[PDB]
Ligand SMILES: [Cl-]
Ligand SMILES: [Cl-]
């Protein structure tokens with residue numbers, strides 16, 4: 001019920017997950033920036049659900065998973081340029097003129113820059129704990145983006161655990177999950193490019209995603225910003241900041257919830273997202 005492909009997007013190949021390929025309206029889903037992050041780790045629950053009615057495209061974002069960049073630069077601002085062009089190159093490669101879009105954290109930041117730079121290519125947007133607002137580094141985002149200063153199974157287990165408000169939702173054994181996720185995290189084909197993305201440090205990485213008030217004011221897309229009240233990585237105040245500045249943005253905040261809203265509250269998030277794209281919360 002799901003297809004994968006490797007598709008040329010500019011100077012490198014993008015690993016792509018797709019579902020609902022027979023559907024007329026598409027959703028592009030952009031994952032977050034946990035160490036070892038990829039499309040499926042973020043979206044494996046949302047994809048089958050949304051694919052009942054939507055054509056879903058969920059790529060590994062450049063530098064992550066199986067979308068290694070051919071000449072990785074250093075500096076977050078330069079990776080944002082790459083991440084934006086990657087999605088445009090993907091849509092062009094699939095012959096898709098306009099798409100709905102969902103973005104988690106880093107992917108939500110990329111979403112904001114996509115709406116700013118290429119507004120004609122996008123319909124509705126859902127953000128989930130997005131970067132893009134100004135904030136001081138959190139304990140979570142620091143330990144995440146600077147993981148490779150001191151990498152270990154234990155450090156990765158801690159991160160994975162902190163992405164959820166109730167870690168037991170993950171399964172009965174998080175140590176085992178960290179153990180199996182760790183080998184992938186330590187490959188040079190995963191580590192080197194992650195280090196390059198946030199080489200300027202957490203503060204420079206956060207600041208790099210921030211759009212100006214004028215830019216945000218001029219994002220005209222119908223939008224839903226979702227956020228976990230207890231998000232340990234991106235402060236809830238970011239969501240409030242964004243909805244204060246983006247004209248057509250609604251807000252939804254989930255209680256007893258960690259950064260990974262889509263994993264902690266699978267049914268609620270999946271339904272809220274789908275019904276938003278369906279038009280249930282239109283004016
Ligand atoms: Cl992630
Ligand atoms: Cl993240």
Ligand code: NA
Nearest residue numbers: 117118119120
């Ligand atoms: Na454009």
